Design a protein around this ligand. Structure first.
Ligand code: HEM
Ligand SMILES: O=C(COc1ccc(OC(F)(F)F)cc1)N[C@@H](Cc1ccccc1)C(=O)O
Length: 454
């Protein structure tokens, strides 16, 4: 039995002021580098333990011992994402019900059906970059967010956000981004009930009402039209849970749609941005990925089967998820008293935080070249120890969107590498902005067309 370390305290506020920063995940990463594989973190009325080693995380990923917990971030997101899949407890009736209904909508098979819609948006991104003048550059996370938001709108509910037609966001997205900003900002507040936060609280309540009103109208409009478009909203209106025999109610469908819009906006766009960042910093890797793109994508429009053959591009995306898992943490609670790694006794209900970027830097797993970008690490999943690589979370509470995200990211990165050469014209210095998720901020490149027709 070992006594785990704890970072510096601030009297009655304990560790809470360590989160008073615009980059709290990167701050926690630095604490993990100093303190090691486990540390205690305390706030008024809160204790958790930050895990960084595959040795301890492999135990945390035992579903017989640990279930998904809502971190404070997810509790604050629940104020608008409700009992949607991402912000529900495993024991809430709507979790397993929505999980059973939606799993077929998110399978590798279902991706054949979403592929044409994904290609519609990917082609819009390629045509935008083709049409840039020689003196112009690309705002990478901006354009990746335009793509991923538009893809989930079209596959979610046959709705065009038309992000490539715009500078200014859709009213739903103004409210969604501001609600995510209030949720993630409220985490750090030493004195949340201070009157200085009354405008923040008023504006939050207004943003929740906006998201609810606009999504409720999308659902109402679809039931009214009777249209049977092959999208998630149709699957949720028609689907029955095989267990209960019940469909989702309109309020839960709204929470699922809000949840999918958060994911499309925040996560896949981060992955594509980090992937292109690592490729321009690693020209030998960029060349090898570009060679695969050219050899496989032999038609003007990629097919589903061709995306499945971009294996090296898939490895590039996994190695980007290794160094910068854009959804960087998940939380677990002990189902019963249990001992972690033979050294740390936990009681029933005790909380754990998995710090995914630190897990992914465990040198006992990846070796001394752990900071290097090497997609070849992923050639043989059987050579990777259990629970070493967790960018989609764990077990039954893992990302339902994983096949969707990787299909879209593989398609688009393959088209980008086929159609353009890239230049890191500014020698960009990685600056990671934290919203719900991690993204390169200010990452810009130049793209020179290979002049290959669509
Ligand atoms: C690279 C892209 C993505 C990454 C890295 C990612 C990552 C994650 C992670 C780590 C979790 C587990 C969270 C936890 O345990 O608290 C999760 C859950 C989830 N993700 Fe994603 N995600 C991605 C894309 C998407 C997309 C595109 C969708 C839907 C359009 C989506 C929907 C969800 C849902 C609904 C859950 C909750 C699943 C459940 O518990 O039933 N994600 N995601
Ligand atoms: O450690 C984190 C990291 O923040 C994120 C958690 C989940 C998250 O979701 C996702 F990974 F899905 F993006 C994003 C960021 N959050 C903790 C921070 C905290 C706050 C107060 C007391 C103690 C600890 C949490 O939200 O509980």
């Amino acid at each position: 039995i070992k006594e785990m370390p704890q970072p510096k305290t601030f009297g009655e506020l304990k560790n809470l002021p360590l989160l008073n920063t615009d980059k709290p995940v990167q701050a926690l990463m630095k604490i993990a580098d100093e303190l090691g594989e486990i540390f205690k973190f305390e706030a008024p009325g809160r204790v958790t333990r930050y895990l960084s080693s595959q040795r301890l995380i492999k135990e945390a990923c035992d579903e017989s011992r640990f279930d998904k917990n809502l971190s404070q971030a997810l509790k604050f997101v629940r104020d608008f994402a409700g009992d949607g899949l991402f912000t529900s407890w495993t024991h809430e009736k709507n979790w397993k019900k929505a999980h059973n209904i939606l799993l077929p909508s998110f399978s590798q098979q279902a991706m054949k059906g979403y592929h044409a819609m994904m290609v519609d948006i990917a082609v819009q991104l390629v045509q935008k970059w083709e049409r840039l003048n020689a003196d112009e550059h690309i705002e990478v996370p901006e354009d990746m967010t335009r793509l991923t938001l538009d893809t989930i709108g079209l596959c979610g509910f046959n709705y065009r956000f038309n992000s490539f037609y715009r500078d200014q966001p859709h009213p739903f997205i103004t409210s969604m981004v501001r609600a995510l900003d209030e949720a993630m900002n409220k985490l750090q507040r030493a004195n949340p009930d201070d009157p200085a936060y009354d405008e923040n609280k008023r504006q939050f309540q207004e943003d929740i009402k906006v998201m609810n009103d606009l999504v409720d109208k999308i659902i109402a409009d679809r039931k009214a039209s009777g249209e049977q478009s092959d999208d998630l909203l149709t699957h949720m209106l028609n689907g029955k849970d095989p267990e209960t025999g019940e469909p989702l109610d309109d309020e839960n469908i709204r929470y699922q749609i809000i949840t999918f819009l958060i994911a499309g906006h925040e996560t896949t766009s981060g992955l594509l941005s980090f992937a292109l960042y690592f490729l321009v910093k690693n020209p030998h890797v960029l060349q090898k990925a570009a060679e695969e793109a050219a050899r496989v994508l032999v038609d003007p429009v990629p097919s589903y089967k061709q995306v499945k053959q971009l294996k090296y591009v898939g490895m590039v995306l996994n190695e980007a998820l290794r160094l910068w898992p854009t959804a960087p943490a998940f939380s677990l609670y002990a189902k019963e008293d249990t001992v972690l790694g033979g050294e740390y006794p936990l009681e029933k209900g005790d909380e754990l935080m998995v710090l995914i970027p630190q897990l992914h830097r465990d040198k006992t797993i990846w070796g001394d070249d752990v900071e290097e970008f090497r997609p070849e690490r992923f050639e043989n999943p059987s050579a990777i120890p259990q629970h070493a690589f967790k960018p989609f979370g764990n077990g039954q509470r893992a990302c339902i969107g994983q096949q969707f995200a990787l299909h879209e990211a593989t398609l688009v990165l393959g088209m980008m590498l086929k159609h353009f050469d890239f230049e890191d014209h500014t020698n960009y210095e990685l600056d990671i902005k934290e919203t719900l998720t991690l993204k390169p901020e200010g990452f810009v490149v130049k793209a020179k067309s290979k002049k290959i027709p669509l």
